[PDB]
Tab-separated table of C-alpha atoms in Angstrom:
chain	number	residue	atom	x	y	z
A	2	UNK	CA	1.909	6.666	-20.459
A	3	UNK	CA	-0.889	3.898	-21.989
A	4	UNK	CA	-3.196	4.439	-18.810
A	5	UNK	CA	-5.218	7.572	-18.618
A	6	UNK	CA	-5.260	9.517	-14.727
A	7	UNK	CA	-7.109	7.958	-12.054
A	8	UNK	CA	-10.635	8.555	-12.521
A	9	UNK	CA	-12.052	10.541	-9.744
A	10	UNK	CA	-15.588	12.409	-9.352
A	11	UNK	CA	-14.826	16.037	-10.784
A	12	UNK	CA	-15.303	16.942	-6.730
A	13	UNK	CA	-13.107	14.783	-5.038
A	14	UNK	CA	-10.342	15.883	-8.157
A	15	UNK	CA	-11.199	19.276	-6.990
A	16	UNK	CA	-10.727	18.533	-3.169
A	17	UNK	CA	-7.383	16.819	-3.912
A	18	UNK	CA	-6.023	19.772	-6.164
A	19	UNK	CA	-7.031	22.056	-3.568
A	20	UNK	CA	-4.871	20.038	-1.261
A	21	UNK	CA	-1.938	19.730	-3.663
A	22	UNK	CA	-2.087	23.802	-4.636
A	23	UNK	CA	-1.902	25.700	-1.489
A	24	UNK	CA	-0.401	29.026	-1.493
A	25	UNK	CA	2.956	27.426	0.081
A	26	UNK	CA	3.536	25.134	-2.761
A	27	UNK	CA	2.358	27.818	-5.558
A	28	UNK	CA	4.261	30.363	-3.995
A	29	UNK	CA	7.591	27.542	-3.887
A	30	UNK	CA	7.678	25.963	-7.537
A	31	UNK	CA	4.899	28.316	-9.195
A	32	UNK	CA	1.109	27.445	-10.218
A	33	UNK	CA	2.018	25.698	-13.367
A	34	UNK	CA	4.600	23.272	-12.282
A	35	UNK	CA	1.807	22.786	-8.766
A	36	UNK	CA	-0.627	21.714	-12.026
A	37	UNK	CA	1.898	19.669	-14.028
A	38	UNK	CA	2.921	17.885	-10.984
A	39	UNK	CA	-0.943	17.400	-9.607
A	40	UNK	CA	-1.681	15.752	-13.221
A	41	UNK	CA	1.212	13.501	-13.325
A	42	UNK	CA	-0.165	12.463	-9.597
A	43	UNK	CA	-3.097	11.674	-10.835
A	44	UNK	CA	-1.422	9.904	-14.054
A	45	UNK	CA	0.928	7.771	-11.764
A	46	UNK	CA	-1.990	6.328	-9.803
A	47	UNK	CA	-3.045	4.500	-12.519
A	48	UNK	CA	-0.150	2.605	-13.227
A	49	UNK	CA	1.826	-0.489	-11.125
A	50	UNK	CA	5.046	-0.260	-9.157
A	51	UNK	CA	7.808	-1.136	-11.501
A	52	UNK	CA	8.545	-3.042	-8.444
A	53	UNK	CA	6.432	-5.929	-6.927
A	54	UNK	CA	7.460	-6.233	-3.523
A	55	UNK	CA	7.826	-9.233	-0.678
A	56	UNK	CA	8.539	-9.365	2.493
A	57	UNK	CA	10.441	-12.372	3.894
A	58	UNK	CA	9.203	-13.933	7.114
A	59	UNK	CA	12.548	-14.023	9.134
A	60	UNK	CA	11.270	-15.824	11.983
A	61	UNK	CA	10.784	-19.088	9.812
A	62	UNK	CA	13.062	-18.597	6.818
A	63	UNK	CA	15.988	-17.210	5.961
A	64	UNK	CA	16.043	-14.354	2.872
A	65	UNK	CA	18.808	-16.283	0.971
A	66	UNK	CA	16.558	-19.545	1.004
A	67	UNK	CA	13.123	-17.777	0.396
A	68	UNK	CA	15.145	-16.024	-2.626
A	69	UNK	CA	16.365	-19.245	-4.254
A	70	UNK	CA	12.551	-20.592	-4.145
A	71	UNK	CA	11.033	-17.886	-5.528
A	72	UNK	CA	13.660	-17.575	-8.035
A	73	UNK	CA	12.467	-21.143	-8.824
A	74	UNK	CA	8.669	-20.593	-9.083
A	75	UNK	CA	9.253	-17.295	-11.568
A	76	UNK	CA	11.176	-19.179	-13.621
A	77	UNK	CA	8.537	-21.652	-13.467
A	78	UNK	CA	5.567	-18.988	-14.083
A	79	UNK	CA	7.002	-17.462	-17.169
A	80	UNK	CA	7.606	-20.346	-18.859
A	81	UNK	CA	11.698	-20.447	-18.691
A	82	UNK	CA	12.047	-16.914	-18.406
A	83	UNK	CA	14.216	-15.904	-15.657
A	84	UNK	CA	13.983	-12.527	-13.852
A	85	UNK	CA	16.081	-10.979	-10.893
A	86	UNK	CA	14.894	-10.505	-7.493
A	87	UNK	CA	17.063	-8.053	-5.299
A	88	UNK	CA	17.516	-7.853	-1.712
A	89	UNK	CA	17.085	-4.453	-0.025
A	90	UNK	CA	20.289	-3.342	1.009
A	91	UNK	CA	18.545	-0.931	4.260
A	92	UNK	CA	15.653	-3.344	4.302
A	93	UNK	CA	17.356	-6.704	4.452
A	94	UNK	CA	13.697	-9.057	4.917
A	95	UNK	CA	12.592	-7.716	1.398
A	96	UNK	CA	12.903	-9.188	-1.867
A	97	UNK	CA	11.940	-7.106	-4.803
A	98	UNK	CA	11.082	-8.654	-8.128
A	99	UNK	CA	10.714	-5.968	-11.335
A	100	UNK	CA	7.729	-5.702	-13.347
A	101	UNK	CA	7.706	-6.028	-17.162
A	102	UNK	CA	7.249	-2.318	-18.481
A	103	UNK	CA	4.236	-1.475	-20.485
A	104	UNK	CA	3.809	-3.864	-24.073
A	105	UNK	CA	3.141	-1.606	-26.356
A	106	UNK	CA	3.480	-4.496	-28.611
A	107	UNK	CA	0.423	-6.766	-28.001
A	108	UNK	CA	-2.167	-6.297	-30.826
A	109	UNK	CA	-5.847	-6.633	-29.626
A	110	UNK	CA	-8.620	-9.367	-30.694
A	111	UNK	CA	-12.033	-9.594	-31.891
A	112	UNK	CA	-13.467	-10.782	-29.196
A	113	UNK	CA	-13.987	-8.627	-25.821
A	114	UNK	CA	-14.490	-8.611	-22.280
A	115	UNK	CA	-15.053	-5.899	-20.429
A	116	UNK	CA	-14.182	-6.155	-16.757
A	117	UNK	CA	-14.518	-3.650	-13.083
A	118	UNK	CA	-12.256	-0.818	-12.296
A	119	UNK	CA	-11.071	-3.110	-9.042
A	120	UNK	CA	-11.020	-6.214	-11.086
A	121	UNK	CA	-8.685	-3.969	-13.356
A	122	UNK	CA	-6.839	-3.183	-10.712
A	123	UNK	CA	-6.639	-6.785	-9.580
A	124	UNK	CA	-5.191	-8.080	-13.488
A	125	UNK	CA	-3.012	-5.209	-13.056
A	126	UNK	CA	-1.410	-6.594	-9.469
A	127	UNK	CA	-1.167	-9.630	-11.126
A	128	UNK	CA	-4.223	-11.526	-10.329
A	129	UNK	CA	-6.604	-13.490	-13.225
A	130	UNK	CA	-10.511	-12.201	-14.587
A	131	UNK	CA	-12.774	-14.340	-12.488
A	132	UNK	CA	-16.412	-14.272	-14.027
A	133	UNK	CA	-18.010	-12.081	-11.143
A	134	UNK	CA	-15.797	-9.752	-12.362
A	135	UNK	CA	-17.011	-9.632	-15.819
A	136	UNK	CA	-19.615	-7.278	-17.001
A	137	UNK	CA	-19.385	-7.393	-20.789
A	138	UNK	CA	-18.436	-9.980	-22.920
A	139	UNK	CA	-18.578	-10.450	-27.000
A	140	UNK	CA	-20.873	-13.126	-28.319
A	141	UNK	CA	-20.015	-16.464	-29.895
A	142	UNK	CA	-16.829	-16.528	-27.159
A	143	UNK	CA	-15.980	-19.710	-26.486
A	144	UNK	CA	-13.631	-21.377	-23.966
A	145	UNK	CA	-10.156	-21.519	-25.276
A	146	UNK	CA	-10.620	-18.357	-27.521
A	147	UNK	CA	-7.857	-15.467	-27.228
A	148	UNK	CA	-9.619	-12.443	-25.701
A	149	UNK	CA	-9.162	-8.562	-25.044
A	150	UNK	CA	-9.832	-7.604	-21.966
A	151	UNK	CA	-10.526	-3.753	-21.253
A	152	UNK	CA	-11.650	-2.011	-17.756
A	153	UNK	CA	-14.869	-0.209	-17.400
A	154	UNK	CA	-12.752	3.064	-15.217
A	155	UNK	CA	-15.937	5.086	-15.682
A	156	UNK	CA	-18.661	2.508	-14.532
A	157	UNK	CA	-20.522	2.935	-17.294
A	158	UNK	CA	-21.280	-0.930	-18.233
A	159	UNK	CA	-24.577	-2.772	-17.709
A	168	UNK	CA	-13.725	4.580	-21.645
A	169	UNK	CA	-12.415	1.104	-22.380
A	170	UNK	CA	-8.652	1.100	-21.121
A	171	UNK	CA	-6.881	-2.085	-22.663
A	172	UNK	CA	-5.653	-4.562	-20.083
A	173	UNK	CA	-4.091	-6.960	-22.359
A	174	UNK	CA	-4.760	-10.471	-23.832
A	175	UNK	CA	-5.823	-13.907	-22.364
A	176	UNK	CA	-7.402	-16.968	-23.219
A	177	UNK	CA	-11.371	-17.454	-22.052
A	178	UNK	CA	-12.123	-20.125	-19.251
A	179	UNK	CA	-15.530	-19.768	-20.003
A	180	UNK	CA	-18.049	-18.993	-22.519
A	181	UNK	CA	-20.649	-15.917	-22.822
A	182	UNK	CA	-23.153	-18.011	-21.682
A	183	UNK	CA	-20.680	-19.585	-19.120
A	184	UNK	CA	-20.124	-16.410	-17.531
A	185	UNK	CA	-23.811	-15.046	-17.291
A	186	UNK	CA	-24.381	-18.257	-15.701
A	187	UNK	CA	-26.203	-18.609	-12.056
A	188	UNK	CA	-23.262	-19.142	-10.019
A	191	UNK	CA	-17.782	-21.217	-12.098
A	192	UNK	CA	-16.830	-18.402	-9.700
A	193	UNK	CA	-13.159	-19.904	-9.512
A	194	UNK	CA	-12.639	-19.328	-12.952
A	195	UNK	CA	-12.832	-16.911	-16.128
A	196	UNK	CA	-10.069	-15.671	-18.539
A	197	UNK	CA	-6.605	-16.513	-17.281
A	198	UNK	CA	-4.249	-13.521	-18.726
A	199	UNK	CA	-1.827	-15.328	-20.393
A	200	UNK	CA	-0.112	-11.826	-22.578
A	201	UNK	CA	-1.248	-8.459	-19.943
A	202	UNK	CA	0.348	-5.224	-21.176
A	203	UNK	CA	2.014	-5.632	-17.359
A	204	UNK	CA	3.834	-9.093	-16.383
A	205	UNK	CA	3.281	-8.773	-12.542
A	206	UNK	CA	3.540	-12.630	-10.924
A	207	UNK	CA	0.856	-13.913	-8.517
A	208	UNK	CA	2.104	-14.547	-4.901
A	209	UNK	CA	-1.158	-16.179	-3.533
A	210	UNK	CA	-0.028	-19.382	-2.824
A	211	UNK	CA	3.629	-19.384	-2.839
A	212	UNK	CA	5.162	-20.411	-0.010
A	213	UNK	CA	2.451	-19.038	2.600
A	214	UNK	CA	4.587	-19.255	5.604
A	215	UNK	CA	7.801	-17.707	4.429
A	216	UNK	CA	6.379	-14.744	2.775
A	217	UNK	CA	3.853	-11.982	3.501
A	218	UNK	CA	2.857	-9.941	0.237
A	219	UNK	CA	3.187	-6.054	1.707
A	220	UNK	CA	4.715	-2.887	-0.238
A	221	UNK	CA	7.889	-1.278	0.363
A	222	UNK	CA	6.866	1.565	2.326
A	223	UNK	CA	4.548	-0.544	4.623
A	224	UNK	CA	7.330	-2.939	5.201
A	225	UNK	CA	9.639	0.376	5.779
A	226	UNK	CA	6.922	1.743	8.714
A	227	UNK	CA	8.097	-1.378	11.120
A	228	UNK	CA	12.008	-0.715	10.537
A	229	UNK	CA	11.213	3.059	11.660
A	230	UNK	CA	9.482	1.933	14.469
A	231	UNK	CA	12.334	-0.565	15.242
A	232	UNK	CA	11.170	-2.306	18.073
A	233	UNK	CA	13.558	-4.444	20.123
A	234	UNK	CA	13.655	-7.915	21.754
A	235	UNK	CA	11.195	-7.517	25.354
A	236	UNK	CA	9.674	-4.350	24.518
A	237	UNK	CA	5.544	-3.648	24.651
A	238	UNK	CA	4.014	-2.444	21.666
A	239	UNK	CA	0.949	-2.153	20.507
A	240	UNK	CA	-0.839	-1.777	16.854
A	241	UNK	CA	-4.019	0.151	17.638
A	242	UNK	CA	-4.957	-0.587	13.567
A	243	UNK	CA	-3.783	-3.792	12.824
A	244	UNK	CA	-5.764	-5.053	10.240
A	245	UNK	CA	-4.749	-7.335	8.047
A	246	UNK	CA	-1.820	-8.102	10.544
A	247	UNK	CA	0.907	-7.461	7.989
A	248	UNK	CA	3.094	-4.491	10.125
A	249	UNK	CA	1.905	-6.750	12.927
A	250	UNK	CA	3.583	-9.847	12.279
A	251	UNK	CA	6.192	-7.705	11.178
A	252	UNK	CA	7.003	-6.256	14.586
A	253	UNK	CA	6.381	-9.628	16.509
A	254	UNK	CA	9.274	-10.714	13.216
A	255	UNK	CA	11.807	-7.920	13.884
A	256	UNK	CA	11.287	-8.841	17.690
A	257	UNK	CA	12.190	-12.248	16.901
A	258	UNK	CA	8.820	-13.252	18.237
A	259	UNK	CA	10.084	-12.069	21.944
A	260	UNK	CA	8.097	-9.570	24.003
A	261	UNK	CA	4.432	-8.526	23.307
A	262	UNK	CA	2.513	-7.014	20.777
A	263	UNK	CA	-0.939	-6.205	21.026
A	264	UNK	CA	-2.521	-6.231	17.786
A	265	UNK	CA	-6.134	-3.968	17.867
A	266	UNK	CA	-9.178	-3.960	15.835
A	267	UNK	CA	-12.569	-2.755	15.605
A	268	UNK	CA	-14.058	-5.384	12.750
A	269	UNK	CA	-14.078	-8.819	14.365
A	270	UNK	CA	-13.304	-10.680	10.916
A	271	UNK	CA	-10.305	-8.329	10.462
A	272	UNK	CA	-9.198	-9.566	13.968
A	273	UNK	CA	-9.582	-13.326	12.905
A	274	UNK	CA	-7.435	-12.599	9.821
A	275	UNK	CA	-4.793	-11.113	11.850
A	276	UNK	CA	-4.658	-14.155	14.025
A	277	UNK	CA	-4.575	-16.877	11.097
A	278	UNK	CA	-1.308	-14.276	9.214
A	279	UNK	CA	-0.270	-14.674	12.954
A	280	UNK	CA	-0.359	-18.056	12.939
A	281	UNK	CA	0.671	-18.869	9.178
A	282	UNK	CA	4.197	-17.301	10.252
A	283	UNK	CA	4.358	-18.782	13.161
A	284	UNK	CA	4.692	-16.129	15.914
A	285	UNK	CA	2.887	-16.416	19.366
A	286	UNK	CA	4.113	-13.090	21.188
A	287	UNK	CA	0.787	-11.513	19.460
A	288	UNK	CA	-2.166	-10.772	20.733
A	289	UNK	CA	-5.209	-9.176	18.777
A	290	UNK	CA	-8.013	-8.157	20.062
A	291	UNK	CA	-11.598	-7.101	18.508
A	292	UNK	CA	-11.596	-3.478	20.411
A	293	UNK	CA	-12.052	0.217	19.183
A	294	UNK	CA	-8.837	1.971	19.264
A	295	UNK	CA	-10.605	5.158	20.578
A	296	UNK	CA	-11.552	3.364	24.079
A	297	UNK	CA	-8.254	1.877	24.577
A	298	UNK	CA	-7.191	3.620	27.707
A	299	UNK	CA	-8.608	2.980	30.790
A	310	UNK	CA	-7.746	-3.896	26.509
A	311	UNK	CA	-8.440	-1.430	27.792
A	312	UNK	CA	-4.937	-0.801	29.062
A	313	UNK	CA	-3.361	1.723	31.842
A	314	UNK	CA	-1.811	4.830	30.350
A	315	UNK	CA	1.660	4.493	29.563
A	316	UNK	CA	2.125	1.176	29.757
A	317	UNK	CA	3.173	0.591	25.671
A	318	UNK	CA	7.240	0.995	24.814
A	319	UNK	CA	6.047	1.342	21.092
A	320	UNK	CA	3.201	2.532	19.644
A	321	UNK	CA	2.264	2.516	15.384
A	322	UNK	CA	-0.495	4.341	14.849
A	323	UNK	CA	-1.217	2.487	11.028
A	324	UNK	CA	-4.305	4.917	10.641
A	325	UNK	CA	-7.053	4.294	8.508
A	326	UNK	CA	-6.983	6.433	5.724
A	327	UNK	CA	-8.801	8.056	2.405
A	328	UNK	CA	-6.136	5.557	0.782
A	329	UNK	CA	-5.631	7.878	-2.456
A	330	UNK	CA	-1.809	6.661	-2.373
A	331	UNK	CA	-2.233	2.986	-3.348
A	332	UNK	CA	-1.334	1.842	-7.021
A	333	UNK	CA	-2.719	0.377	-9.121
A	334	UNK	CA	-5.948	1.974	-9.060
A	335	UNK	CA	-7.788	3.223	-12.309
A	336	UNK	CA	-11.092	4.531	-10.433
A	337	UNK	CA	-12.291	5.983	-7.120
A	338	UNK	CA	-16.184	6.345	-7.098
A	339	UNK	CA	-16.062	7.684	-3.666
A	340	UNK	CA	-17.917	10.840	-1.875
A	341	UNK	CA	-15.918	13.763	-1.059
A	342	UNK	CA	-17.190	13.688	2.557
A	343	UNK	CA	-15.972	9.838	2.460
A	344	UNK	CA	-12.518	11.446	1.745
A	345	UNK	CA	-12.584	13.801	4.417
A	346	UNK	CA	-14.233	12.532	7.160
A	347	UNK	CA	-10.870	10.757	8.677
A	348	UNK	CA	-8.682	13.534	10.297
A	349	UNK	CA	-11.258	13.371	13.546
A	350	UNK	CA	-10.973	9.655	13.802
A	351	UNK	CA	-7.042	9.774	13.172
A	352	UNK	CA	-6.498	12.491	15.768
A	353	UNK	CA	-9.253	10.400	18.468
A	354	UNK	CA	-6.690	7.351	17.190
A	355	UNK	CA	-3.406	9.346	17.712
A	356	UNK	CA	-4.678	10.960	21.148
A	357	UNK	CA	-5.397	7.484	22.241
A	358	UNK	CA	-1.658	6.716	21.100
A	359	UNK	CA	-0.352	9.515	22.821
A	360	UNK	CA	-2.171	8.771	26.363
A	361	UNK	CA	-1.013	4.796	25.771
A	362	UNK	CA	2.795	5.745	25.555
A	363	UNK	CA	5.457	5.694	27.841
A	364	UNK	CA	7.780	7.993	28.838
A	365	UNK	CA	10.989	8.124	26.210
A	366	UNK	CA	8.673	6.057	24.405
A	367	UNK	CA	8.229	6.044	20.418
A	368	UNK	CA	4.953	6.672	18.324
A	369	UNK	CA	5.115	6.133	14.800
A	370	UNK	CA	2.108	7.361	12.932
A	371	UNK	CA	1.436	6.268	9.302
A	372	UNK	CA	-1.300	6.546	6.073
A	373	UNK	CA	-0.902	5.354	2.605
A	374	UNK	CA	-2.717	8.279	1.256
A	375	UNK	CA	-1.447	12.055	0.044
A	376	UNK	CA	-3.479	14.473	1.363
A	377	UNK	CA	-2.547	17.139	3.151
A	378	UNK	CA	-5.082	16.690	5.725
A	379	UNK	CA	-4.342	13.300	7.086
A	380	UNK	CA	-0.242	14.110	6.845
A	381	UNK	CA	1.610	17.263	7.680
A	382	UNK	CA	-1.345	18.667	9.022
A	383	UNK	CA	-1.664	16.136	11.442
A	384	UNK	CA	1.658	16.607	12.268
A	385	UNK	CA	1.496	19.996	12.822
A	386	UNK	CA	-2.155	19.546	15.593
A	387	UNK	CA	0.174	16.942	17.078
A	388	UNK	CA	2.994	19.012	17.414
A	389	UNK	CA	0.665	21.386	18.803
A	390	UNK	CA	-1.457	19.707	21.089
A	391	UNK	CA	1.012	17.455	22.067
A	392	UNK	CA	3.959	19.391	24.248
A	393	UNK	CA	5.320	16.179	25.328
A	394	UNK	CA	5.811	15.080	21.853
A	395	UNK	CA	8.866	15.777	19.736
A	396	UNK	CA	9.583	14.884	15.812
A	397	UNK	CA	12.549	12.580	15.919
A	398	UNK	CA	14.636	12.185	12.264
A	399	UNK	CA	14.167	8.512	10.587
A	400	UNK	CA	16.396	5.341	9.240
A	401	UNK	CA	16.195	4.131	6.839
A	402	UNK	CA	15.094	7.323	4.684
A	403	UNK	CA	14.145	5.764	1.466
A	404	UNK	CA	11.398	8.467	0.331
A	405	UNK	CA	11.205	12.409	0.156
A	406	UNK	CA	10.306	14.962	2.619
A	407	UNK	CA	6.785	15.984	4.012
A	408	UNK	CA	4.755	18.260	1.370
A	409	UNK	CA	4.524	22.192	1.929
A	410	UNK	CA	1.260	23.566	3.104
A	411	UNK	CA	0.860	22.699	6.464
A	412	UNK	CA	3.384	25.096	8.242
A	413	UNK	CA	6.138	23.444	9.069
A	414	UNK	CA	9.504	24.538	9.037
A	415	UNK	CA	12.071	22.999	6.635
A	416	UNK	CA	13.779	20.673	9.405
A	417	UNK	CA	10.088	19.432	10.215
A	418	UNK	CA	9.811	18.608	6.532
A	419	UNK	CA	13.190	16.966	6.081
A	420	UNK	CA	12.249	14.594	9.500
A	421	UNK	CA	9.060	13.146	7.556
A	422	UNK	CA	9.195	10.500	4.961
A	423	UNK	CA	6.420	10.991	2.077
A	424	UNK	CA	6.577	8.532	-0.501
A	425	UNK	CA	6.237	10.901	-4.209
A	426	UNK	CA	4.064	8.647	-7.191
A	427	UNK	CA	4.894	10.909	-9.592
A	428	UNK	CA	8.786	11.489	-8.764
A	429	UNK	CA	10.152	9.706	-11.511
A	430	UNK	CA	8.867	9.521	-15.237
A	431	UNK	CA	7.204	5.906	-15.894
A	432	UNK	CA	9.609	3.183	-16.536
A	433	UNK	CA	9.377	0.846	-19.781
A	434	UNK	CA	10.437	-2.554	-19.745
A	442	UNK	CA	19.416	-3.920	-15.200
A	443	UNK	CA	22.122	-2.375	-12.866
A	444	UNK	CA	21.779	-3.327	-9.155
A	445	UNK	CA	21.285	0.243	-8.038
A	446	UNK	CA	19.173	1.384	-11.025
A	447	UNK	CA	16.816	-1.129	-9.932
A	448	UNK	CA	17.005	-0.076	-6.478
A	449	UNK	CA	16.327	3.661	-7.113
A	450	UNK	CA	13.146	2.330	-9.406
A	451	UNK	CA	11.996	0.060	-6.200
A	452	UNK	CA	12.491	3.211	-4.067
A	453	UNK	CA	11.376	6.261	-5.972
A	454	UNK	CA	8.303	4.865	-8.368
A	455	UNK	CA	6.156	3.538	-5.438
A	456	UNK	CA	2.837	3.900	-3.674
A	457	UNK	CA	1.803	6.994	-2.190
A	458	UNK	CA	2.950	6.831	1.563
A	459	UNK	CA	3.764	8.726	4.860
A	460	UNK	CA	5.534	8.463	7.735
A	461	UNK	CA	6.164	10.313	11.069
A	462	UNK	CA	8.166	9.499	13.975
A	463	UNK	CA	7.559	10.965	17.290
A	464	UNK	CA	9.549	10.499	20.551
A	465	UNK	CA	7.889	11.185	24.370
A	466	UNK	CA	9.616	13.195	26.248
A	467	UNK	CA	8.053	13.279	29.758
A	468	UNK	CA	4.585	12.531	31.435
A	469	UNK	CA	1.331	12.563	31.551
């Protein structure tokens, strides 16, 4: 639409396409529709959710009450205007609120400010242009003037895609000051109206996408039950576990970066649940935390991933080996998983990326390596099936949820369910796999 692709190093582009054009998918829709649909990936990345999502912490607040407020502080952001927020029918703890469609109606200023591809990403999520995030900046600007803000995609500011308009904090000489790092240029007309949720009502909500939020309802742990999050950071599918459990049982939260671990205890403890119990430990050692094999109910295998699924993002100035070098850690991760799970026991394994690589082909090793395991069917299914190219067989495919970017054109801004089908088909890049054990070990 108004956003170019996401801008990748002609490499990684060229690992991903060779991902997204294997001879299975070529030889099922043909090379030019593989290439139309690769581009419009790669043009969908760019661009935000129509759909902002939240999820509603049920363990402190109900979703009718949590609605009402938040109805209340919209219509108190926009200035009077208020906008609709819908309550998944299959996923009944989140709220969805819709994003205003591109403005292809704002007309840009004189003066400029040219901000980060992550900062861009952060105006387009809803967030304001703090002046560390500022890298360019038109003289004379004082504070109060109306400003254009563009992104730098390219990173090639000591190729300018317009954000939209706001009104300057700060002046030229404000901003390349020597550290006024809490304010900048607060976007008061972006080309995309996305709220900010970052200090609403901290202990009723959590701010998590709709297929994150969909990964705990797949797992669907029960009241008593073990289960353990061998990824956990930032706590989000955590808490939502210890939620859906209604904080009674155990689940071990598990980290490798210490500071990770502390911020899954404080979400813990913003939301109020004490059946949790994080620990700063490597996944990889976690049987012997550590813990005796078999001795999990549940097991979500959240693994860390190249991440080329999350949206909005304009730029990834990452290494092609960077982007590759996660399948051995995943399956170290997922063998771990495996070992840690009882018998009849469930493993739910997860990314928020679309390569082939870290998705169907892991499913396919685990399938292989993994007699005990076998692929169980999912509910609720809210995204498509698994992507061709792995070998799997068309039952396989249909028992995998992968989560399409590009499946619908981009919306421009309603019915009940033609909001819903925006909220469920224009979303992040995600997958999901569900895995039952069936004996010993």
């Amino acid at each position: 639409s108004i956003f170019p692709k996401i801008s990748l190093r002609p490499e990684v582009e060229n690992y991903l396409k060779e991902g997204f054009m294997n001879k299975e998918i070529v030889t099922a829709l043909g090379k030019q529709e593989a290439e139309r649909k690769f581009e419009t990936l790669l043009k969908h990345l760019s661009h935000p959710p129509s759909f902002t999502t939240v999820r509603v912490n049920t363990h402190l607040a109900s979703v009718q009450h949590v609605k009402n407020l938040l109805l209340d502080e919209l219509q108190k952001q926009f200035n009077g205007l208020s906008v609709p927020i819908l309550q998944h029918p299959d996923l009944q703890d989140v709220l969805l609120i819709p994003v205003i469609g591109p403005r292809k109606n704002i007309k840009k200023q004189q003066c400029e400010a040219i901000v980060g591809a992550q900062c861009g990403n952060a105006v387009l999520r809803g967030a304001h242009v703090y002046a560390p995030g500022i890298v360019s900046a038109s003289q004379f600007m004082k504070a109060g003037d109306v400003i254009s803000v563009y992104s730098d995609i390219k990173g090639k500011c000591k190729t300018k895609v317009f954000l939209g308009n706001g009104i300057s904090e700060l002046s030229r000489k404000e901003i390349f000051s020597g550290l006024l790092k809490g304010m900048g240029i607060r976007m008061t007309e972006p080309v995309y109206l996305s709220p900010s949720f970052d200090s609403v009502l901290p202990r009723y909500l959590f701010l998590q996408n709709l297929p994150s939020a969909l990964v705990s309802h797949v797992l669907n742990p029960q009241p008593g039950e073990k289960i353990l999050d061998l990824c956990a950071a930032p706590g989000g599918k955590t808490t939502h576990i210890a939620a859906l459990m209604h904080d009674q049982g155990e689940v071990i939260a598990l980290d490798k970066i210490f500071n990770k671990v502390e911020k899954i205890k404080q979400n813990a403890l913003l939301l109020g649940l004490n059946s949790i119990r994080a620990f700063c430990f490597d996944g990889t050692k976690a049987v012997k935390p550590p813990f005796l094999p078999e001795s999990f109910d549940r097991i979500l295998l959240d693994a860390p991933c190249s991440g080329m699924g999350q949206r909005p993002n304009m730029a990834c100035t990452w290494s092609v080996k960077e982007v590759a070098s996660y399948q051995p850690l995943q399956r170290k991760l997922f063998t771990a998983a495996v070992q840690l799970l009882k018998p009849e026991g469930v493993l739910v394994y997860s990314t928020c990326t679309i390569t082939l690589a870290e998705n169907e082909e892991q499913v396919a090793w685990a399938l292989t390596k993994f007699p005990c395991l076998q692929l169980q069917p999912q509910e609720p299914q809210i995204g498509g099936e698994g992507m061709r190219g792995a070998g799997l067989s068309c039952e396989q495919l249909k028992q995998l949820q992968r989560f399409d970017p590009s499946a619908v054109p981009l919306p421009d801004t309603a019915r009940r369910e033609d909001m819903l089908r925006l909220a469920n088909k224009d979303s992040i890049g995600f997958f999901i796999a569900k895995f039952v054990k069936c004996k010993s070990t």
